[PDB]
Amino acid sequence: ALSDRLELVSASEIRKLFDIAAGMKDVISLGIGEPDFDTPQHIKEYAKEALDKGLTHYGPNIGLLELREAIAEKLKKQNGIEADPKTEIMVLLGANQAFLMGLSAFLKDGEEVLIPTPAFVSYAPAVILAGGKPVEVPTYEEDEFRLNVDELKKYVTDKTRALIINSPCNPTGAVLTKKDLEEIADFVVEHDLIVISDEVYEHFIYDDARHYSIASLDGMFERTITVNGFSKTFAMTGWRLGFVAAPSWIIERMVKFQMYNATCPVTFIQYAAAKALKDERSWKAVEEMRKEYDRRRKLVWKRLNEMGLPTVKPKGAFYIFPRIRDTGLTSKKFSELMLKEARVAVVPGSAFGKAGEGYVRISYATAYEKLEEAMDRMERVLKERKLV
């Protein structure tokens, strides 16, 4: 039963870090998994307009049609994904809902779900809650943390039914290239898996990197649940609005699940997001945010490396994952030390899976000045403790 599965889910290491950091002052948090920017004003204005228009009643379990149509257009233009807004697109209370609900549309007892690690903290627990068995597939820093099909093939079994992909990736910041996705797609097809693609950080890509969606690849829509949302893209984390595009049979089961869960997303919020998707100001805001994230990203990448922590330059999202194993400390002890002496909160790499052990996650979704200060604090401790 669900209660048994919930008991199998381990307590959060990020939760533990927060509880401790909170009880201390002068601490700079680098464990934030959300934008620091406020929601663009014009979007706030669209929400106010929706409130004046009286859009405060229930909407379809699947989401407002107007929003689904706006999402279909965004998917087509930006991602090359063709999805019918009437049956293949569902709005959710944040993109986070997609994993538990999406997997519940097909996952059977004991079936395995390949989860490339380091991985976002929601994946494994969602698999366990759905009734399956999570199977971690390590990614390596020498591969810029890009998932390698060589690794997937070693961990796949006859019990494997799904694969969860995340690009741009949280916590590594890795971006899967088109060739990477083509190879993953072939593997997915070969093993008759359903692949869930988490693309919420799609717009925060840097350097020469481009965002490709696996569902846009030849014959992939029939076996892909594309997950995205407005939380990162429009700095709307507190608005709780995400969405998925998938075959209608999966969508039908997801709305059925929703009928006994959150029912439907916030009506006036959906109206604002539909208007936001078609407003040039929304995208100009996305560009400004990406620019600032990039400025902070170059700061932390250079500082981490120069202070003695080999760090892969992230190509997407707003996270960076420095190697800390050479200091002789475990990810947890490294985080404990930084919180106590540097007054800087970083997430132990192990929180993202075994492959994350030996690393630590730092989020640069915070003021540049705060980042400069946290870098100095961290470097001070590393050098004083002779860890570098």
Ligand X SMILES: Cc1ncc(COP(=O)(O)O)c(CN[C@@H](CCC(=O)O)C(=O)O)c1O
HSE of 235 in the Cβ direction (CA atoms, 13 Å)? Answer: 23
Is 23 a residue that touches its own copies (CB under 8 A)?
no
| Residue reference for tokens 């100095």 | 376
**Residue from 21, 27, 28, 55 binding its own copies (CB under 8 A):** 55
Q: Which parts of this chain interact with ligand X (CB under 6 A)?
A: 33-34, 58, 94-96, 120-121, 166, 170, 198, 200, 229, 231, 237, 242, 263
Is residue 380 within 8 A of residue 49, CB to CB? The reply is no
DSSP 80-116: -----TTTSEEEESSTTHHHHHHHTTT--TT-EEEEE
Is 20 a residue that touches its own copies (CB under 8 A)?
no
**Residue from 21, 27, 47, 307 binding its own copies (CB under 8 A):** 47
Interface with its own copies by CB under 8 A: which range of 108-116, 166-174, 182-190, 367-375?
108-116
> Restricting to residues 256-285, which ones interact with its own copies according to CB under 8 A?
256-257, 259-269
Annotate 136-193 with three-state secondary structure. EEECCHHHCCCCCHHHHHHHCCCCEEEEEEECCCCCCCCCCCHHHHHHHHHHHHHCCC
CB atoms within 10 A of CB 183: 17
Q: Which does 87 bind (CB under 5 to 8 A by kind): ligand X, its own copies, none?
A: none
Strands 112-117 and 160-166: parallel
Which phi and psi angles does 238 have, rounded to 5°? -75, -5
Q: Which residue's Cβ has the minimum distance to ligand X?
A: 33
How far apart are CB 236 and its own copies at their closest, in Å? 6
Is 107 a residue that touches its own copies (CB under 8 A)?
yes
Is 96 a residue that touches its own copies (CB under 8 A)?
yes
Q: Which does 102 bind (CB under 5 to 8 A by kind): ligand X, its own copies, none?
A: none
> Restricting to residues 57-86, which ones interact with its own copies according to CB under 8 A?
57-59
Nearer to its own copies, 133 or 377 (CB): 133
**Span between the terminal Cα atoms of the chain, in Å:** 48
- Residues across the chain: 388
Residues lying near its own copies in the complex (CB under 8 A) are found at: 1-4, 6, 9, 12, 34-35, 38-39, 44, 47-48, 51-52, 54-59, 93-94, 96-97, 99-100, 103-109, 111, 122, 125-126, 129-132, 235-240, 253, 256-257, 259-269
